[PDB]
Design a binder for this molecule. Structure first.
Ligand SMILES: Nc1ncnc2c1ncn2[C@@H]1O[C@H](COP(=O)(O)OP(=O)(O)O)[C@@H](O)[C@H]1O
Ligand SMILES: [Mg+2]
Ligand SMILES: [Zn+2]
Lengths: 198, 646, 49
């Protein structure tokens, strides 16, 4: 089940949600939260509709009339004529799947290196080697917020995270960084959060 | 006809018998319409009808001398859209009997009008190509002031009502031409819909195998459809009658044309249909239900402002009107003129009216996506903090009745879920659906919150997200999303004890958290000065109401401003704004006053941009920023309050 | 019995008895026609109907 992206909502509307169907190789190619890009064909699917208003019956074209005691009236006649309601839903049949915004042009560092192209890999390498990368990342990630350099640095470290670990007895050592911002109103806290999300 | 395919008209329902009956001329059975006479009358109406009272502003691109709808047909030739909106009022004026026949027999008459328009159009143009034959939309039928007064005698007739859209269901596909294929020889046949049903071939036409033909759902042909839950605005409101919700149905071109919260005059056929006892049995109920097969949507209203769609449309103003509005802008006191025009019968609230006008005009929409900053609120928010009986409720109601996409809530009558969204069981599909709230229905308009202090924080918390990021992030059990709520909030608050103590400071009297008050980019203290002249003139005005600029120009000015005015900060205005914010913060550092945070610099930018838009400058200027300063300062009575006490 | 809607409890299978006194009857007769003796070929049997 997918729903329309926020970039396409009309005014005052609720996003339209439709079910798309993946077949064969693509069966598990979409995961929750992903901004996928389904390519395929729209289709209709017969529906067992609960509409109490009759509509669009389909029946035989052979003119047959029940004899006395077996008249084509009621459920008997409906069944004999083969009357069925033509109620449909719109469903999407996706042959291929792919993210809307590709990140690159199990998981491991070598896997990421291979997945990313030569230009992207060289850019990553050169920025990794670049000096003052800490300040560069902070500034490039928060180009509108002034001050709060400590908050910027903390959020960057949170984004990079730690190294989760598990002890011999089983107890786990959390490696994720938790950050909280407390302060006076209009101090850019929501701005930091929205930067992080976007 | 020129070989064009005559598309079906699902709005007109399933075609009927169409039995011709001779009265001895050759009427349709059960009616008094003869196709030849109706077609000739409508052809005459098209060929030669001129509006004597028509105004150049009422009709744009239309000469009041040449016949009206021939120019419309010329437009339909120029563009591809094969639709012709015909005014039932014009039909009534031209041929009254034709109007009565149209209103009483829409399904029969309207196809004759379609035939006539197609004949005339394809006679005039032997080469113009259209996807389908032109279709006639009769609107402006004599308004039905209340659906509750319509009677079974009116069923299947063309009525017109008015109301705001509460909900618009998903696109429902409808069968029009079934496709059948043989399970033996693969012989293909098509069966068009006939009187609301389809006849299965039951025998192959090639191999003669009985019942070898199977229906191919996705090779058949379908047409769009959409349920629309609309709330009626009955002009005639009898005592003890609650508001009314009426089911509409759009068909194949009106699907997804009116969003929830939009106010529209809907002209359409008033249908009555049976109710099945169960969704699985065919037994129906003796009592039918009624709905509206919509023929035409009309957005334009006389007592409201131009809607978003009308503003977007290019040909909304004649060149003469554009020049007139530009002259009115070059006029030096346009700001005060428009402020006075707003709420003409509210006595000398000049500053509040100016603020409300700036709210209506709104700032500039900004695309900060590339900056990773978020979405900036261009809307302006106003809070009228005043003693009960200071006309704040009157101003709220005036704005509510003036603005399109306006919602109104008061005090403890609202809830967080009811304002944001919720889940109900649509009692026509028996399916669980999601219904919006006031803050969403007013997405691109205004929400008026009266009694803004009796708003127990459980629901007042919702306003933070709406007023900060124009978004309403709902994460409920099943549905997760963020709804656009780009509203403008006009709120009314009463000081604690329902009376303004002249000893407690501004904040101590307002009693609203600074976190919230900093969101409102305008706060007006409606306080009563015990003044002889004010009391005397107010009494004169109030008594004058007991015995005795144009809305048109105001509406057109606002529409043009929104259409093509996008003020941009100039360098001088930028420096002025910087100095304004520093001075305002310095002043607001006082103990009890309303302190100023960078949200107030944002507010000053918003107000300056709104004033520039009012001036049609397209460039925000030091004049605009100074006016924003003055307005924000006179509001809250900063000049009249010392930096220590109130 | 198709008229089961008048009451929920149902009538049996094969419930109908013909009412004699409500029958519109007519006279009917059976005759045995034999080929014409002058039509029967020489060595043959007379056909019947
Ligand atoms: N230190 C700052 N630097 C830049 N902008 C700021 C700063 N503080 C506040 N702002 C501005 O004020 C606006 C409102 O801040 P907001 O996100 O509401 O903070 P909070 O959520 O903590 O009240 C933001 O859109 C932001 O641009
Ligand atoms: Mg915040
Ligand atoms: Zn066949």
């Amino acid at each position: 089940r997918i729903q329309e992206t926020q970039a396409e909502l009309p005014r005052g509307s609720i996003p339209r949600s439709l079910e798309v169907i993946l077949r064969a190789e693509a069966v598990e190619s979409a995961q929750a939260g992903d901004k996928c890009d389904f390519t395929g064909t729209l289709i209709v699917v017969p529906d067992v509709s609960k509409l109490s208003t009759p509509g669009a019956r389909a029946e035989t074209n052979s003119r047959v009339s029940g004899v006395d005691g077996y008249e084509t009236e009621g459920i008997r006649g409906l069944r004999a004529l083969g009357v069925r309601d033509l109620s449909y839903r719109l469903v999407f049949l996706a042959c291929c799947v792919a993210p809307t915004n590709p990140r690159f042009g199990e998981q491991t560092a070598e896997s990421i290196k291979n997945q990313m192209t030569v230009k992207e890999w060289e850019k990553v390498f050169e920025m990794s080697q670049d000096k003052n990368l800490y300040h560069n990342l902070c500034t490039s990630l928060f180009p509108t917020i002034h001050g709060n350099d400590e908050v910027k640095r903390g959020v960057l470290l949170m984004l990079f995270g730690g190294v989760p670990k598990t002890t011999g007895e089983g107890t786990s050592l959390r490696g994720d960084i938790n950050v909280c911002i407390v302060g006076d109103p209009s101090t850019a806290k929501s701005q930091f959060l929205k930067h992080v999300e976007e | 006809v020129r070989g064009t395919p005559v598309r079906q008209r699902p709005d007109l329902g399933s075609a009927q018998k169409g039995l011709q009956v001779d009265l001895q001329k050759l009427v349709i059975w059960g009616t008094d319409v003869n196709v030849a006479a109706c077609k000739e009358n409508f052809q005459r109406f098209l060929q030669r009808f001129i509006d004597p009272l028509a105004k150049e502003e009422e009709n744009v691109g239309i000469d009041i001398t040449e016949p009206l709808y021939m120019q419309r047909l010329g437009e339909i030739n120029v563009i591809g859209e094969p639709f012709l909106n015909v005014n039932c009022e014009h039909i009534k004026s031209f041929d009254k009997n034709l109007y009565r026949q149209l209103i009483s027999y829409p399904q029969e008459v309207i196809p004759t009008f379609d035939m006539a328009v197609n004949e005339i159009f394809f006679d005039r143009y032997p080469d113009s190509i259209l996807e389908h034959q032109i279709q006639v939309r009769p609107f402006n039928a004599l308004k039905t002031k209340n659906m509750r007064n319509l009677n079974p005698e009116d069923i299947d007739q063309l009525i017109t009502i008015s109301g705001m859209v509460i909900r618009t269901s998903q696109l429902i596909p409808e069968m029009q031409e079934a496709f059948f294929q043989c399970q033996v020889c693969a012989h293909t046949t098509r069966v068009e819909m006939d009187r609301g049903r389809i006849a299965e071939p039951s025998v192959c036409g090639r191999c003669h195998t009985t019942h070898s033909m199977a229906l191919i759902h996705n090779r058949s042909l379908f047409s769009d459809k959409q349920m629309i839950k609309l709330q009626e605005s009955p002009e005639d409101m009898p005592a003890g009658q609650t508001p009314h919700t009426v089911i509409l149905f759009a068909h194949n071109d009106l699907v997804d044309k009116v969003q929830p919260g939009d106010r529209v005059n809907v002209t359409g056929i008033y249908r009555a249909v049976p109710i099945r006892v169960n969704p699985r049995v065919s037994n129906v109920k003796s009592v039918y239900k009624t709905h509206i097969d919509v023929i035409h949507y009309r957005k334009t209203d006389a007592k409201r402002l131009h809607g978003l769609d009308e503003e977007a449309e290019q040909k909304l103003f004649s060149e003469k009107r554009v020049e007139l509005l530009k002259e009115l802008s070059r006029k030096p006191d346009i700001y005060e003129r428009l402020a006075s025009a707003l709420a003409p019968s509210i006595y000398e609230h000049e500053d509040i009216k100016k603020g409300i006008l700036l709210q209506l005009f709104g700032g500039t929409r900004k695309d900060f996506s590339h900056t990773g900053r978020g979405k900036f609120r261009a809307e302006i928010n106003i809070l009228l903090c005043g003693d009960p009986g200071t006309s704040k409720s009157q101003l709220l109601q005036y704005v509510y009745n003036l603005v399109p996409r306006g919602q109104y809530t008061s005090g403890k009558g609202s809830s967080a879920v009811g304002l944001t969204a919720y889940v109900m069981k649509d009692p026509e599909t028996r399916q669980l659906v999601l219904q919006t709230g006031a803050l969403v229905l007013s997405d691109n308009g205004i929400c008026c919150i009266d009694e803004f202090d009796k708003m127990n924080e459980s629901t007042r918390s919702v306003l933070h997200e709406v007023m900060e990021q124009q978004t309403l992030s709902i994460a409920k059990a099943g549905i997760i999303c963020q709804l656009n709520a780009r509203t403008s909030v006009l709120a009314a608050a009463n000081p604690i004890e329902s009376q303004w103590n002249p000893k407690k400071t501004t904040i101590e009297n307002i009693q609203l958290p600074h976190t919230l008050l900093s969101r409102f980019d305008l706060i007006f203290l409606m306080l009563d000065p015990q003044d002889e002249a004010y009391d005397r003139r107010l009494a004169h005005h109030l008594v004058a109401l007991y015995y005795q600029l144009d809305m048109a120009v105001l509406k057109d000015y606002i529409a043009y401003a929104h259409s093509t005015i996008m003020p941009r900060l100039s360098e001088e205005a930028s420096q002025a704004l910087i100095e304004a914010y520093v001075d305002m913060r310095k002043i607001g550092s006082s103990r009890g006053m309303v302190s100023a945070y960078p949200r107030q610099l944002e507010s000053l930018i918003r107000l300056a941009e709104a004033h520039a838009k009012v001036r049609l400058s397209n460039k925000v200027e030091a004049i605009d920023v100074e006016e924003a300063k003055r307005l924000h300062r006179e509001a809250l009575k900063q000049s009249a309050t010392d930096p220590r006490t109130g | 019995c198709n008229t089961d809607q008048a009451g929920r409890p149902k009538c049996p299978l094969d419930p109908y008895f013909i009412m004699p006194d409500k029958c519109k009857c007519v006279d009917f007769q059976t005759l045995k026609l034999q080929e014409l003796p002058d039509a029967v070929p020489h060595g043959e049997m007379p056909r019947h109907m």
